[PDB]
RNA sequence: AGAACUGGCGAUGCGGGAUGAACCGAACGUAGAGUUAAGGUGCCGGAAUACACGCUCAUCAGACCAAAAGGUGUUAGUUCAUCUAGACAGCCGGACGGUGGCCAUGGAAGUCGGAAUCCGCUAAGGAGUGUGUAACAACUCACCGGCCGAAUGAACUA
RNA sequence: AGCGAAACCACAGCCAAGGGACGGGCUUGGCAGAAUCAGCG
RNA sequence: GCAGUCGCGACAUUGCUAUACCGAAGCAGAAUUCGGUAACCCUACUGAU
């Protein structure tokens, strides 16, 4: 209803530090750094005691308030990625054809290659984005673990890996071949 | 616009007032009062406790409603110093009125104990481990001859909700390692309690303890830490 | 339902528009009244299509007896057609068929869910009666199969006249 | 196909590792998809969609009233 | 389609309407100064990209009658309620014994179905809203019990 | 290479839109490049 | 169309009278179906100075 002023609070743990430009927010911590940009969100930052930040919008409408409310979650995601990190474990299963997942640095862009899926001769691969690392889970057969500090990048890579190996218009229930997200959490989960 | 989107009705303030009136009109006809924070007790256990002495009046409801009925402070105390009971009660609103001996009642409360599932924040009674093969209803803690294999219907719940590496082999839930849920004395989380409830294993024992006691005619409060 | 389908098939400026609306609505009303036969047709079609491929003219061997004692394993071994072998009260509710070859000759083995009426047992009884086959009745000497040997013998004797 | 193959495969191997999650996500998205379809799909299709939505709303109201009265 | 009265046309210039005889003003000698009607004041177009209060992203809006109704679009009002004895929501816990009520019956025990919807305890539990297993099993919403904090949900008008 | 008409002619030849009935010279737009021969499409 | 069940009475209601790409249907494979992206004349015409 055209609120005069709305604000949301963000708590920054002592383990990390924050630097606010006009609309560029940089977070630094033990696990790395992030350089997020909120140029399109149009919100105002305000420090309290170097540990509490306020993201505010004045005279904003319902849409502006809704957009502002996402700033707190976005900053919390960056802080969590910087401190603990984000990890996704995806187990790939097959009916008859063994789905082989391999990592080869072809062209240098850490290409993840999936071969023999559904018996298809075509090789399906996705270029791993910067910042995210990948590995094979130990003692967990046919599982790939992705780790990183950027939740957006990690989740996008995980989604792309699952989408590039979609079954070719076959029965959903019968052809279970594919890759699915078995678990999601933090690298140094508490 | 854009706002967020059975045959049992709500009780509400009418039932709250009914309970308050019942407490007010029934407290004065007894000798001893006990307050207990029965946070997690199964319904059969509660029924057993109630029937242990049919002559004792059980009372429960909203914490604030019971506090108001007993008198929030001295200004509204139903009996002298009775507001101390409301002040010192902070957990669940278990309450009992009785005429039996205070010593006998407290001894019975201390002695009472029943098997149950280990609740969160409690120490693990034993290093519960689901075997490295086909899982069973009892979590493999007993021989397969006396145990029944788990059905695949709930396999997704184990896989995702409980976060364990379960998989389907010929329609049977199986894991590839002796999956330990907790070690001896480990602090249990909600996942462990849910797993134990699913397996139907009474992991630990629970005994109801009185938080505070009150004598009516003397109109006096007292502490009884029968843990 | 078939008769209703046949009946529906055989039944079919401003004044012209009204006549066109009359015809369209009459067809729509006929279709709507045909909803029950159409609903039955869809349900029966969703099950009839994948029915067992029984061939009476082929060399058929039937496995019959009381509920599954484990004889489903014998059929699963003689023919590659996988069949449930779980030992609960009634394993299957329909005919299970499996093809194989012997001495360069084709054979098909058909299992019976169980004979103790019920439609499940009636289907197997009718198949045995109306289909040429060589039949194998199963009994148990051990604790398996639940039912008594005397009851099994009585059932066998009662079924003997037509089997 | 032994008269039950579709159910046998499900009961012996189960659905996708995240089929339930995908179905839940689709059900959640249906709330906004209904509005998207109402705004889009102009013409005879839009008129039919509006009529169907009105009929469904009337049926839901009648069912709710009957359920409440059955008390 | 028919009776009937008033105003333009007829016999009619002029201003504006992109343009239209029937739309609004205005009815006419040749000229100058000044003030206006209707219509306009971003350019073509002479005049403020004037001031003040709000609404709308329209994916060919808006400047021009079939449509009652729908939209998890947006923005304001009326009627009910619950509220510091705790507004909605979020998280955890109980969610009962008789009972596996009776029957169709190899099985419908709460969930393939019919009649009923029985009583006891309460803080509350439907002979059960669904998932699902061959039936049991397990989860469960609505009903209640613990942490968080205060206005919220429903039915209508516009 | 020479001689040498007739018919016809208010006046000429780029289109879209509206003109609530007719648009070819009314109106709003796009554009129009002098002059000039040929195959008929 | 008429009639009826629901002071005017909104939906239900009973009587007679091409290819290609997507989600699905009980899609085992193939094939099939449903819903979407929707497939002697003006101006002349063209060659050319």
UniProtKB/Swiss-Prot annotation, chain A:
Q: Which GO terms describe its molecular function?
A: rRNA binding; structural constituent of ribosome
What keywords tag this UniProt record?
Answer: Cytoplasm, Ribonucleoprotein, Ribosomal protein
The organism's place on the tree of life at top rank = Eukaryota
Extract the InterPro entries matched here.
Ribosomal_uL6-like, Ribosomal_uL6-like_a/b-dom_sf, Ribosomal_uL6_a/b-dom, Ribosomal_uL6_CS2
- Give the UniProt subcellular location, in the record's own words: Cytoplasm
A Pfam family this chain is assigned to: Ribosomal_L6
Q: Does the keyword Metal-binding apply?
A: no
GO biological processes:
cytoplasmic translation
Cellular component terms (Gene Ontology): cytosol; cytosolic large ribosomal subunit
**Role description:** Component of the ribosome, a large ribonucleoprotein complex responsible for the synthesis of proteins in the cell. The small ribosomal subunit (SSU) binds messenger RNAs (mRNAs) and translates the encoded message by selecting cognate aminoacyl-transfer RNA (tRNA) molecules. The large subunit (LSU) contains the ribosomal catalytic site termed the peptidyl transferase center (PTC), which catalyzes the formation of peptide bonds, thereby polymerizing the amino acids delivered by tRNAs into a polypeptide chain.
Q: Which family does it belong to?
A: Belongs to the universal ribosomal protein uL6 family.
Further facts: Present with 52400 molecules/cell in log phase SD medium. There are 2 genes for uL6 in yeast.
Question: Any idea what this protein is called?
Answer: Large ribosomal subunit protein uL6A
Q: Which organism is it from?
A: Saccharomyces cerevisiae (strain ATCC 204508 / S288c)
UniProtKB/Swiss-Prot annotation, chain B:
Q: Name one GO biological process term.
A: maturation of SSU-rRNA
Q: What one GO molecular function would you report for this record?
A: large ribosomal subunit rRNA binding
Instruction: Spell out the Gene3D superfamilies in the cross-references.
Output: 3.30.70.1730, 3.90.105.20
| Key words of the record | Cytoplasm, Nucleus, Ribosome biogenesis
Task: Name where it's found.
Answer: Nucleus, Nucleolus; Cytoplasm
Give the UniProt entry's GO cellular component terms.
Answer: cytoplasm; nucleolus; nucleoplasm; nucleus; preribosome, large subunit precursor; small-subunit processome
Task: Describe the family membership recorded for this protein in Swiss-Prot or TrEMBL.
Answer: Belongs to the universal ribosomal protein uL10 family.
**Entry's PANTHER family?**
MRNA TURNOVER PROTEIN 4 HOMOLOG, MRNA TURNOVER PROTEIN 4 MRTO4
The protein's role, per its UniProt record: Component of the ribosome assembly machinery. Nuclear paralog of the ribosomal protein P0, it binds pre-60S subunits at an early stage of assembly in the nucleolus, and is replaced by P0 in cytoplasmic pre-60S subunits and mature 80S ribosomes.
> What does the further note read?
Present with 18200 molecules/cell in log phase SD medium.
> Assembly state and interactors?
Associates with the pre-60S ribosomal particle.
State what protein this is by name: Ribosome assembly factor MRT4
Native source organism of the sequence:
Saccharomyces cerevisiae (strain ATCC 204508 / S288c)
UniProtKB/Swiss-Prot annotation, chain C:
Residue positions binding GTP: 65-72, 111-115
Top-rank lineage group of the source organism: Eukaryota
Q: Where in or outside the cell?
A: Nucleus, Nucleolus
Q: Which family does it belong to?
A: Belongs to the TRAFAC class OBG-HflX-like GTPase superfamily. OBG GTPase family. NOG subfamily.
Described function: Involved in the biogenesis of the 60S ribosomal subunit.
Subunit (UniProt): Associated with nucleolar and cytoplasmic pre-60S particles. Directly interacts with RLP24.
Q: What's the further remark here?
A: Present with 28000 molecules/cell in log phase SD medium.
Q: Tell me the protein's name.
A: Nucleolar GTP-binding protein 1
Can you name the source organism?
Saccharomyces cerevisiae (strain ATCC 204508 / S288c)
Q: Which gene encodes it?
A: NOG1
| Section of the entire sequence shown | 94 to 278 of 647
UniProtKB/Swiss-Prot annotation, chain D:
Q: Where is this motif: Nuclear localization signal 1?
A: 14-21
The stretch of the full-length protein covered here is: 2 to 72 of 261
Q: What else is known?
A: Present with 8660 molecules/cell in log phase SD medium.
Q: Where is this motif: Nuclear localization signal 2?
A: 50-57
Q: Could you tell me where this protein is found in the cell?
A: Nucleus, Nucleolus
Q: Which gene encodes it?
A: NSA2
The record's similarity note reads: Belongs to the eukaryotic ribosomal protein eS8 family. Ribosome biogenesis protein NSA2 subfamily.
Q: For bias kind Basic and acidic residues, which ranges apply?
A: 1-39
Quaternary form? Component of the pre-66S ribosomal particle. Interacts with NOP7 and RRP1. Interacts with RSA4 (via WD repeats).
Q: What does this protein do?
A: Involved in the biogenesis of the 60S ribosomal subunit. May play a part in the quality control of pre-60S particles. Under normal, rapid growth conditions, high levels of NSA2 would allow the progression of pre-60S particles through the ITS2 processing.
Q: List the disulfide bonds.
A: none
- The name this protein carries in UniProt is Ribosome biogenesis protein NSA2
Q: Which portions of the sequence form the region Disordered?
A: 1-42
């Amino acid at each position: 209803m055209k609120y005069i002023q709305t604000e949301q609070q963000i708590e920054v743990p002592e383990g990390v530090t924050v630097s606010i430009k006009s609309r560029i927010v940089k977070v630094v911590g033990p696990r790395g750094t992030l350089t997020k940009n909120l140029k399109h969100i149009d919100v105002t930052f305000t420090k309290v005691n170097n540990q509490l930040i306020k993201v505010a919008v004045h005279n904003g409408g319902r849409k502006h308030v809704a957009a502002l409310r996402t700033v707190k979650s976005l900053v919390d995601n960056m802080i969590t990625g910087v401190t603990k990190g984000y990890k996704y474990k995806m187990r790939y299963v097959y009916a008859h054809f063994p789905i082989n997942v391999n990592i080869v640095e072809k062209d240098g862009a850490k290409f993840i290659e999936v071969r023999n899926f559904l018996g298809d001769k075509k090789i399906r691969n996705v270029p791993v984005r910067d910042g995210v690392t990948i590995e094979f889970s130990t003692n967990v057969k046919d599982e790939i673990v992705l780790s990183g500090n950027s939740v957006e990048d990690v989740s996008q890579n995980a989604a792309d890996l699952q989408q590039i190996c979609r079954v070719r218009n076959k029965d959903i229930r019968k052809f279970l071949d594919g890759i699915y997200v078995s678990h999601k959490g933090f690298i140094t989960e508490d | 616009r854009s706002k967020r989107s059975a045959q049992t009705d709500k009780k509400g303030r009418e039932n709250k007032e009914r309970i308050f009136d019942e407490v007010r009109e029934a407290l004065d006809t007894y000798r001893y009062v006990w307050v207990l924070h029965l946070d997690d007790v199964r319904t059969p256990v509660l029924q057993e406790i109630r029937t242990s002495w049919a002559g004792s009046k059980l009372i429960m409801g909203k914490r604030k409603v019971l506090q108001k009925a007993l008198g929030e402070k001295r200004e509204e105390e139903y009996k002298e110093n009775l507001y101390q009971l409301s002040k010192l009660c902070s957990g669940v609103t278990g309450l009992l009125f009785t005429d039996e001996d205070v010593n006998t009642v407290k001894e019975y409360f201390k002695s009472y104990v029943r098997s149950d599932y280990s609740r969160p924040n409690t120490k693990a009674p034993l290093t519960f481990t689901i075997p490295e093969g086909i899982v069973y209803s009892r979590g493999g803690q007993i021989p397969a001859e006396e145990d029944v294999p788990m059905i695949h219907s709930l396999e997704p719940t184990m896989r995702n909700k409980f976060e364990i590496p379960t998989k389907i082999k010929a329609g049977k839930i199986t894991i590839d390692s002796p999956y330990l849920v907790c070690t001896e004395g480990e602090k249990l989380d909600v996942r462990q309690a849910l797993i134990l409830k699913q397996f139907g294993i009474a992991a630990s024992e629970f005994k109801v303890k009185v938080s505070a006691y009150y004598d009516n005619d003397s109109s006096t409060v007292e502490s009884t830490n029968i843990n | 339902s078939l008769a209703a389908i046949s009946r529906a098939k055989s039944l079919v400026l401003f004044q012209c528009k009204q006549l066109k609306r009359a015809a369209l609505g009459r067809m729509a009303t006929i279709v709507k009244k045909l909803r029950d036969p159409l609903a039955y047709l869809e349900q029966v079609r969703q099950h009839i299509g994948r029915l067992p491929s029984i061939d009476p003219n082929t060399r058929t061997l039937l496995i019959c007896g009381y509920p599954n004692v484990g004889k489903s394993s014998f059929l699963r071994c003689i023919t590659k057609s996988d069949v449930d072998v779980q030992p609960y009260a009634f394993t299957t509710k329909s005919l299970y068929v499996g093809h194989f070859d012997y001495k360069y000759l084709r054979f098909q083995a058909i299992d019976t869910p169980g004979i103790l009426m019920n439609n499940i047992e009636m289907q197997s009884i009718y198949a045995i009666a109306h289909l040429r086959s060589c039949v194998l009745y199963f009994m148990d000497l051990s604790e398996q199969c639940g039912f008594t040997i005397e009851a099994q013998v009585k059932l066998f004797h009662s079924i003997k006249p037509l089997f | 196909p032994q008269n039950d193959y579709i159910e046998r495969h499900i009961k012996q191997h189960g659905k996708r590792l995240d089929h339930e999650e995908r179905k839940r996500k689709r059900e959640a998205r249906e709330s906004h998809k209904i509005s998207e379809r109402a705004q889009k799909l102009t013409g005879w299709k839009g008129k039919q969609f509006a009529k169907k939505r009105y009929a469904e709303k009337v049926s839901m109201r009648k069912k709710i009233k009957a359920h409440e009265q059955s008390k």
